[PDB]
A paper describes a structure:
Microbial rhodopsins (MRs) are transmembrane light-sensitive proteins, found in Archaea, Bacteria, Eukaryota, and also viruses. MRs are composed of seven transmembrane α-helices (A–G) with the cofactor retinal covalently bound to the lysine residue of helix G via the Schiff base (RSB). Despite this paradigm, the first light-driven Na+ pump KR2 was identified in Krokinobacter eikastus in 20132.
To verify that flash-cooling does not affect the conformation of the O-state, we solved X-ray structures of the illuminated KR2 at room temperature (RT) during continuous 532-nm laser illumination using both single-crystal and serial millisecond crystallography. Structure refinement identified nearly 1/1 ratio of the ground/O-states populations in crystals in both cases.
Author numbering:
A (entry chain C), B (entry chain B), C (entry chain A), D (entry chain E), E (entry chain D): 3 to 271
Write the structure that this text describes.
Amino acid sequence: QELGNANFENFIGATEGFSEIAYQFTSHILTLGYAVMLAGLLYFILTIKNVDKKFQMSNILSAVVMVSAFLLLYAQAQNWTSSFTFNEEVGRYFLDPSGDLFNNGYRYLNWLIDVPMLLFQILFVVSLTTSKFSSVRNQFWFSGAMMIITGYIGQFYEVSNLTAFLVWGAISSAFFFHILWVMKKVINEGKEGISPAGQKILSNIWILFLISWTLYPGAYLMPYLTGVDGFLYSEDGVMARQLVYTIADVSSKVIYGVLLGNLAITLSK
Amino acid sequence: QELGNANFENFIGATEGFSEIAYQFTSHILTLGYAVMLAGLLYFILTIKNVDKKFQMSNILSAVVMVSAFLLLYAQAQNWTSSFTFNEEVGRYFLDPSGDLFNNGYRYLNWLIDVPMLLFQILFVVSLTTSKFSSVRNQFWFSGAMMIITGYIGQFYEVSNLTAFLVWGAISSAFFFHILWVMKKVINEGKEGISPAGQKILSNIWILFLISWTLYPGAYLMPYLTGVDGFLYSEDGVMARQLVYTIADVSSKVIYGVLLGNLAITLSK
Amino acid sequence: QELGNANFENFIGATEGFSEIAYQFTSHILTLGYAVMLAGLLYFILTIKNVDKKFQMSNILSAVVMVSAFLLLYAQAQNWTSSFTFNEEVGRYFLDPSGDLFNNGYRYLNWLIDVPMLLFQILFVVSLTTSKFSSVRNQFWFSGAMMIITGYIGQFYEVSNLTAFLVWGAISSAFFFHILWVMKKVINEGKEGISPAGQKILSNIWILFLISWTLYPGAYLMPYLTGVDGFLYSEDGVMARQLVYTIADVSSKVIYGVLLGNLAITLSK
Amino acid sequence: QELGNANFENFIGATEGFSEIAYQFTSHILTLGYAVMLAGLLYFILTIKNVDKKFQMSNILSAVVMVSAFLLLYAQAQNWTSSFTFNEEVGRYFLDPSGDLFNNGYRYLNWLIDVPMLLFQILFVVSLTTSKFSSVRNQFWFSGAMMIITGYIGQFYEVSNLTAFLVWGAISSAFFFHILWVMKKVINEGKEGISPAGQKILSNIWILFLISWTLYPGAYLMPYLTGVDGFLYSEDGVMARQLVYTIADVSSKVIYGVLLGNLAITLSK
Amino acid sequence: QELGNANFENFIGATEGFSEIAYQFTSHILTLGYAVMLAGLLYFILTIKNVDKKFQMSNILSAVVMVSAFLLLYAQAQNWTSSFTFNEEVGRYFLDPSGDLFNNGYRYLNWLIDVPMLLFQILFVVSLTTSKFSSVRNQFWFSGAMMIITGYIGQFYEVSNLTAFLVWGAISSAFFFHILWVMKKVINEGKEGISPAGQKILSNIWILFLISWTLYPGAYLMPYLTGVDGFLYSEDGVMARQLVYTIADVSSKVIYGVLLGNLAITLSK
Ligand SMILES: *C/C=C(C)/C=C/C=C(C)/C=C/C1=C(C)CCCC1(C)C
Ligand SMILES: *C/C=C(C)/C=C/C=C(C)/C=C/C1=C(C)CCCC1(C)C
Ligand SMILES: *C/C=C(C)/C=C/C=C(C)/C=C/C1=C(C)CCCC1(C)C
Ligand SMILES: *C/C=C(C)/C=C/C=C(C)/C=C/C1=C(C)CCCC1(C)C
Ligand SMILES: *C/C=C(C)/C=C/C=C(C)/C=C/C1=C(C)CCCC1(C)C
Ligand SMILES: CCCCCCCCCCCCCCCCCCCC
Ligand SMILES: CCCCCCCCCCCCCCCCCCCC
Ligand SMILES: CCCCCCCCCCCCCCCCCCCC
Ligand code: NA
Ligand code: NA
Ligand code: NA
Ligand code: NA
Ligand code: NA
Ligand code: NA
Ligand code: NA
Ligand code: NA
């Protein structure tokens, strides 16, 4: 059977199949995913009147990210349970084509709209010094878009064409480093003028941002991190990838938004 | 196989079929579609108290457009994934009649109610000079309705009867030019009396409106933009059409609404 | 094939079947239906603080009508697409019994709870003179209930027993005329004491009410308006009936509610 | 065919089957059911600021009842349409085991949480004289729980074991009479100290409570009210039972809550 | 038939099958579950302005727990009805593999985000004396996470490997005792400085917490509480487990949250 330009999850499910644990876990971690986003949406809305009017735009953007995040991730959780059916004879879940092939695309388009908002909301809490608001914003939005788009193309060839998969991943990485660079400037200029408490938080935000955002490219390579025909090129790699995505999503959106809220309160009078 | 007066998407899916990329992409772009609309709905509601009471009717109408836009576009996303099933032997998605034929109708009825509201909300932010409120409104609502209705009829014959398809498309275009004419007047009269900042925004609103609204008729012809049996009369044309629709929808409703909100704030005291 | 006491839509779908246009259109018009109701619900809630506390009960009842309307009309839209499946050989949608027979019952029960509220809410905007509030209310609620119940019974025999269908329809009409009579009194007494502007609106409300409410009995007979084996006793009659219902529903609930809101503002200080 | 300890609806659907009217009606009355509850939820929330802060706890509990009532009753509606499929040959709906057997359980668990809240909310509007708040509450909550639990057990044997069905029904009745007794005291003590207007309402509340609550045990016996192999032990009895439940539910929750709201306003200053 | 590392519910359903009562009851108790959580969500939101701003964080966290709880518990409910189909011949519900194997995982990952919030919210109502806020928080969050994770692993081997099932259960218990220890300290330090009324409530909160939290490990062993081939290793054990979980969930989240709210009011001025 020819799957073509499909994610490696389909190849594992079509050949070896998934064990009760592998399948169930992936379902639970994706379910917990959209559950956290709807819980976060409620939090950011109920805590809007806890910061000065000038910082409230941060809670609004956090809520915007949560909504879309819930819908896309909710669909992604359905794309999984629908693409794999249990085989009584062997007692493993195999690719059910009638439910469509599983694709990490829904999550990539969730980033396309999130990335821009996540990078833009910090500009409503911190105050730039030598950098222009419009300038920083435009850089984030451009590099952010190019990073997602290029990566979205590569993930389609993560099996069919390993070369194209890495080339696009590399190009994407380029824009990723540029974002890290601009964000570093914003953090530094943000620390200037605020209390030691506010600086302490911005320091934590930078570490969170650095680690959480690095997990994404990690999940992208997950199936080949132990080389071809490696330990991760199995159902173990599938669990690992979806787990890492879930950890990254919660950290980069929910926790990131909570810290911005805490900073907003610290600067509130 | 007899399809009758059906959209060209069904003909491609019934003959050639769709590749993993073509099918998946179309699913992601439609999913992102309704996701953005629900995110926008939340934004316009949370920012109502950011403008004077006289301009708040603009945020309310934007929210009204988002709601309906979310429901119709959601149904459209389901109409896709349901109409095409994966074939293991060849590894392509083919027309699954049990899920009903795919039709871009749901999107046409979303416009019918939207168009009127989108054209009417700007009349709550800007002040007419040499034009009567009721007069302008009646023109938008009439031409707007005729434009959608005529187009809705033609799209059914985009394959079965190319002649009827173009004739209706032409008639529709007539009312489209009339709307562009009236909107141009509204923008000009709107600039008179407001600050240079407000004028700057109205200038951007006009450009956005002109480009975003022109994309629709482009998506209408998409399958024949490279002539019959052309490059676009394939799964590539299907992807292009649904992508263009999504770009147009986000720009004409969400972004258009954000700019109106920004102008409202600029005129707020 | 034995259908028994079923709506004529089932007979057309079981014999002739539905064309792509006939089926798709009916789906779009029903979809637009519930979409408008959810858009209206949001409008009436966001405009509650736009009228004096004494008139706000009108917006609340409008919202109550929208909710129930959305659910019932949504269920109806799903009932249609479920009752008819596409036949590849002939290329037409035929009755799929596994999805249950299509019935206009969900809409008849939507009226049962709506009619009472729609007639009751106007009594919170206008002021009676010689008529008692309780008296008028009791008449509307009684005649309203009997009108819906009797009609609900008749619609089951619109094919199986043409006699019973007309007899019940006639009895129903009796209570309909009584409602028109009481509503006429309410409008007259309502005009006395209010400004010419308020009177202008009440005049428009009466015209809207008269036309929109008359469309329902029109949709009831739709299949026989061109006599037995007539032009309307086809898929054309099916489209016509569902279209008329949608126009009537939007006019009698949403537009009727918007006009009452405008009158409330006119009388607000 | 072996059904075991199943509701009589399954036996009628498995043997005689259901006519278009019997099936459709049951679907409409259950649909109207959950529709009314969501409409009521919106009403109680939008009218919270219409009574003094001390009475607002009544609207909150009414809203709590509506929510859970909507979800359960919605699940009960789905349980119906899924358990019975149309047979083309005979033209009647028969038991479809793949959709699970129909059980009035979802409604019995809705009461388990509702009953306690419905009996408890009246204690926030009226003022006891010689009776202790905590004492009355504890009695309602205990007798209320025992009444539902015992009844829930009996309904499982309404066909399999007529003896057990009546024994449990009898035990349940015991706790029902005790509730009627305590509620009567609460009404009397409630009338003392309030205006004649408030007393008028409490009188209506007592009548509503007495009739609406008595309908439940009536629906419990519905299939045997005309003795075994009687007129009601048919599809007619099924329609009657689900109709009675719907009337009881709307009256005991929505109407009961509206009257409490009216009384709260009467006592509000 | 090979099930592998699956929950015991699947083994009972695959061999003996489930009776109408066993299946129906499990469905009702799980349905009531998510219904209570959505009812609680509405309560905590509508009662936020009933306590001083400093205690409102307790209501917000209660609402956060309700949301996630509703989504996960809803999924768990669907997982049940989908995994077991009725067999006409024997008249019992058997494992339907096409609907996936039933797993109590969705409820476990629900505790993962809940536990931390439930232990953290009490720190916003009570005031520590000799214990550091950050210190107590970190202990709860760590032990809480390890307790859930370890237990989540063990529940997969509750049949396949009884040894691993008990070992993990034991390790989990270790962290459970540590949580009970820290919570005991928090309660004691919380009682110091507050009124006798507040102390009375904290005493009730401690009893509720102790009993409700102990039920979980009880549901974990439920199938072996009467040893292998025991009375509980049947459909009776399945009902018991899901019942206990539901009672524990309502007590540990909803009731626990209500008491914290009542304590907040007691300390409010
Ligand atoms: C909430 C969503 C977030 C934070 C998304 C972040 C996405 C990235 C940081 C993506 C980066 C990638 C690369 C650097 C290379 C491979 C492809 C990507 C897109 C995964
Ligand atoms: C949010 C929805 C919007 C802005 C819809 C706009 C629709 C049009 C501008 C449609 C125009 C068309 C023509 C000019 C010719 C072909 C048919 C149409 C309807 C696509
Ligand atoms: C929003 C719902 C509304 C306004 C419903 C109105 C319903 C009617 C006016 C029904 C009238 C009928 C007759 C006069 C005879 C035939 C049967 C009816 C019920 C369609
Ligand atoms: C909104 C829910 C309400 C008011 C539920 C009420 C339920 C009862 C009054 C039940 C009574 C019963 C008996 C007295 C005997 C038979 C079994 C019951 C539970 C139906
Ligand atoms: C609302 C969710 C709550 C309160 C969850 C609580 C969970 C536990 C107390 C779990 C404890 C366990 C053990 C002590 C051993 C067996 C495994 C667990 C996780 C069930
Ligand atoms: C004030 C607004 C100005 C914003 C400037 C830049 C932000 C928009 C980002 C969108 C750019 C995406 C373009 C994609 C290029 C095509 C990718 C093809 C693959 C190489
Ligand atoms: C106050 C902010 C810092 C929080 C730190 C306190 C601890 C909370 C996070 C706990 C993380 C648990 C992760 C478990 C590790 C892997 C589990 C292995 C399975 C045996
Ligand atoms: C301060 C209030 C204390 C009570 C609240 C806690 C409520 C939980 C009640 C415990 C009862 C659960 C026992 C269920 C029986 C199921 C059979 C178990 C078989 C081993
Ligand atoms: Na599956
Ligand atoms: Na598909
Ligand atoms: Na309604
Ligand atoms: Na269909
Ligand atoms: Na309920
Ligand atoms: Na059915
Ligand atoms: Na949860
Ligand atoms: Na089932």
